[PDB]
């Protein structure tokens, strides 16, 4: 009855708690489409996936597909303005991005629900008539080269591409994917290639409709959505491109029984064991790869990790199948290495095969599969409502692998118990099929090979046959028992009835000298889940560097102890987060409310009654010091962000200060620290979810009663609950802090324009101005000036203060970017004066939409409340209140704000800049916009003297 | 603060290339004010708009609002001299006028920038205490009666007023607006009404301050202007008149599905299709009327016109929204009709609804709106600087509809794309809502109705139900495709830097036997625009009537061929004008310089490689013959000018001479004409704008190279470049040429006093004398003696000669008008001898101001240079040279000039008169001034014998 629709899918099985409406289609051109109607969503979204990726790149232009991704945004035949896509979405509360794997290219966006069509039309044109403007091609390649440069000194990227290079060099697996300036301009222009043809030749050849999948999520009806999708996409051309598949495995015989010794950039000690396996993707109903990954990577009692941990060799273990293109997969076992573990790699790998041998002798266990089936079934029934942008993007990728009807469930539910497949995969996990990778700084200078793309230093050795035989004849270790029935599986999913005296916002149901309990029973989602957030205040968690380290070590030791017990809970959708802060400790417990109080008690009991294993202490204390040193290898812009945090906070310890005081942390002092830390506390907590007021009060008092009994905890005085303040910069001032990054050869910079204390007025002034420049700053500093890959502009909130911040990571010196971002600021002044009165109210409505986006899941709503709480501001109706004021603003109110607080010659300009110089960058001192003349900056020489000479801002009045 | 200012507008968004400064005000009495400060302007200006017009006229005094317009100029209480307003502006390089629509009355003036205050004071008095002197009222009604009489025999006015009468007769839309002697004197004096009371009753009632808008433009600062404006206008009285609005549409049910067959005065064939629609004025941000008007009235490939054109039915199509008062609008589609098109009106209108149905099935196209929004955005950024008199009047009108800040942009920029509104208007365009009007002489005698005001003959028919159903069931025509992306949108707006060897005046950078290229790089405006003027000389373009006709047909056919191609360019701010002259062809290309060489090449290529469509040839050749016959229905004063042009030019072909020889133009002869016309040419060209010297040489060489390749063009001999001379009249001579106008019952006359060849001395003598008599000639012959509505006096320049000319259109016989202008000339003889030495030097400053007015936009500056070029005079510094001499003139030097060249008994009087008698005027032979005695005139019997018996003036020496 319609010629543009090949077929229509039947009922799409969804979670019975899912209110949304779904319809499956296959267009005439073979485009698999899923339509999602959610009349509640404040933002609509859509995404398209092409079953092509890096592996189909031409041999001579590595990275073309990932480059073509960048180039689809920069102009279409119908919408040729270079940034009409970015500009349209920014003005309509939208965002967008895209990624490129080996077999997929995935484009997605979201936007205000009233402009889905306007966005979709502009978005759809990507696959019909893209410009590939020569002017934009020569510019955007720098964004790709900067993107790669960031990754060049990253240990995870260097290993990623190392595995590719280490296998069969003829296999597309070895292809370089990211692409850089060499492979995309220098060498092609060196081989005479016109890249714009190779972009059009590729786009026209592979971007066929038969290899595309589309997901559209909007308020519109399912029928309205169907006509919209058919209207815009039925004109995509079908080329009947055969789906590429790679049956030959990238790792052949000569690539097996090999050992690699790799020099890392950070200070880490890791061991990777890999086995090639066939494409298990088609067995999704039985999922044998995850059955084995569950048992191998198990962290519970009697597990493989437990013994490697007990022997003081490893600390973490990760196992399971690793994805590869159609026709080949891998099986990885990842362990970090202690100092001793590095010397016993032979035994570690043996212990691995001893556990595998155990799994072979016991055979497939139906009860395990039944457990995994039941757990997934629950997780899917009570699946949290996904964000539209992430939801549409994920489904668009999996429409290629599963029938229309199962698309929602295919990745969750299990059906077939296939013990034959388990034994089949378990037989490929053998020493004659193994590949071993060791990463340790100890191989410095002992390497003889280099990886051409990232520079990785490594050495390749064949695994001695003598060692293989030891692994093959793997005796059974009596320390490896199969896991037992998970006792944390939830059984009570009953949604408690909504109390009469219930509230819409969290209520303060307890305000004692020791506790302060915020409570709200969930009235929006009705899932058997709850979030339990606790802030423990103790002035002894950050009083000096020595105590900060012990605060960290105290918890890292505590969590290490509970891992065996708690791992079962984690599997049962019941997790806990525990870590130190600058004000004390933070404990979060989210998941199914059934077994929740049982886990929380075991945590608080273990807190107050903790006994330290000396062997574990010395191992974590070491790993912690490497984690501090390894900060020198972070991105230059993260250095800038780190340093600025140090400069503007009243009290704050540098990594160097902590690292020095860490040697003085003897176990005696740590054993004495804990009881000192727990002796006086104040507890501010948020209990939010499927639980009643009375149960919530019981939770809080249980944490109190446990601490009082076993730690003899007393309350704090209200005068002790002092929050740290932010430094008050002087009017017309400009400070510059200069440091270097010894690792990365990129430069970084953060620029902080300090406004004033947070307030309903000063908040919206900033948030609106940052909305108007959000997009143009990206188009000017990256798309045009191509300063780098990382260009961020937005508000900075901290310690009750705020301001505008720019963050750039580039190849240029920072003092250049200073002028360029300063020159851009004057570009905005005009752009505002010329901005129409209507285009202005557009931005206001854009900010108001993003500010009033309703939280989709319980976890997200809790954050809003938890943010108002830790901030001591307690403004739970901030969104309605602040949006109301925002709409009353005029274009003139913004101009006076810029002229008064921000402009280069403003009277109240508060500017502080952080310059992070590239590794080899010498000590710093046309068709572009004019940069203003800048005053002489005051150069911070010492951070402590800097703060002593400046006032401190007050603290925000609460409520 | 200030109490006389209700509020002050913030930054008024302006074009970012606009140097002027703007401030918005709302006075206490509700007068919306815009202040324009332009310290560059040579002329200051101001204008006031009243939101009242013809529609608010009393039912018994049709035209009162348009009558009150004429009456405010004739005296004020503070300035009671009847012409103190007209006189003041004339003595200070000023001008003024005003018009009256259905909802507005708009007064405006300009004046020397040093006298804005003096003029504004006199101007403001219009709305405070006007005289309405009874003596002037009885006189000015003739000025209104003559204005209507002019329009009585005009086809556009007769249709205008016909539609009004054809709708609801109770609706103010049906009101007579222009007013004549009947509605303002004869009928009122018969019903006892005192018109002078109704003028004050109306003025006092409707001329309220709350319905006024004021714009003042001057060199003064925005504050000084603000003080001036408030001083003079804050004393206007606020009556709180409610703004009239007309929600009832003039066309109700009984007025729809009607057809009208109308007899025109000219021989024309037109078809008007109208649909009543609601007042779309409020949806101005999205403007759905222009989206549909854009697509319907589109002339590109696949458009409605192309198929109606291809079927040989129409030649032009016009579409869009037609303005009506608040609460109702119209939608018109205007197509001319070929001979065959006249017989296929049913099918033509069907083809109309077939196209509309196409627009409904494809629905609104957002990419189209984005093209219009981006195109308008460009045009506004690079907006040419407007003349003060026109700018203030246009802005004064739109201050009533938009906020103070948006006034400048409201009518240019678009923002919201509202497909819901587009579907709303597209639904009002349906056959059951249509009104059809056919205009053709073929309905002569077959009409049964007459329009009471203009006498229009028409017949009213109901559209048969059978025809309506056919139109409704409009199949989709495969010949109607949506327009495609406009490829002429400019992308390179780069302002080229000013070359070192640049000049202030056009330089002659090429002087060959074939070309002579004048060049100037724009050094004043710096917009991405350029003007390309070309004069092609061929002696075969005017050798005889047959060749003159083929010159016209050649270009009119060529433009017809290019229209489909060039229409896109027109939209992209890139237009071209092409037409024949008495020396050859003239091709002009103005607009954005980016895509300019692409269009110029396609024109010159099409010139030399032109192939004639036989069907189009016969259609234009017919339409061209009607255009010649239809000249008999032009204004009598236009006949007088036409005849005088024939008498005084060496060679000149009459309409009758061409029209008879037009039958002999067979297509073969035209095909042979073109290559002969192109075989030998001389090209004199002016390239001026945003372009370099070498780019200019590149432009010319392409025009040359293209002509040589495809037309084998050879140069002309210098002796072939013969210009036409003007007849040398004998001293003390007087000739009279008498003809009739068969259409209009008014008489016309031009009087030419020939002085001598143009020269810096003889030029300024005339230009000054015409300045002194400029105003008094209007005040004496119209304001006092009320000879008619059209009374013009000024210099006449032609073929290197000059002289003084009077032009009057009256009801009186011409030979009477002859004496009156002679009687006025003696009035001036006295007025000069008695004129003060101060009043004399005032006129000198008046002429000097107007001569030295700097051009505001590029198009205007090119004209000044282009005039010097075609005139073979090449005096680019004429204004400074002539004004310098002008100041050295004395009152005595003028008197001797009059006694010698102009006076009735001067020794060198050279007088020639043209008498055009009204249709029914018999063959022509108090308190007023004494008319002098005139000699016996020599009566021109044949124009050729006239020229044969007289010498010919030389030609002006250049440089
Ligand atoms: C020379 C050689 C021999 C044998 C194996 C390897 C090898 C293979 C893959 C990796 C990937 C690389 C990014 O692709 N890394 C990031 C750090 C650890 C996280 N994970 S993961 O834990 O392995 C992993 N992801 C999915 C499942 N699981 C278990 C990815 C690992 C690293 C090293 C090499 C390089
Ligand atoms: C009895 C009857 C029924 C239906 C319609 C009409 C009717 C109404 C108005 C007109 C006017 C007439 C003089 O006012 N013309 C000028 C030539 C064609 C141009 N246009 S225009 O398209 O609106 C138009 N020019 C410029 C922009 N735009 C939108 C007006 C048309 C002509 C005919 C009548 C008289």
Swiss-Prot record, chains A, B:
The N-terminus is blocked. Its EC number is 3.4.24.56. Its cofactor is Zn(2+). The modification N6-succinyllysine is found at residues 150, 655. GO terms for cellular component: basolateral plasma membrane; cell surface; cytoplasm; cytosol; cytosolic proteasome complex; external side of plasma membrane; extracellular exosome; extracellular space. Binds 1 zinc ion per subunit. Its main location: cytoplasm. ATP-binding induces a conformation change. Belongs to the peptidase M16 family. This is Insulin-degrading enzyme. The gene is IDE.
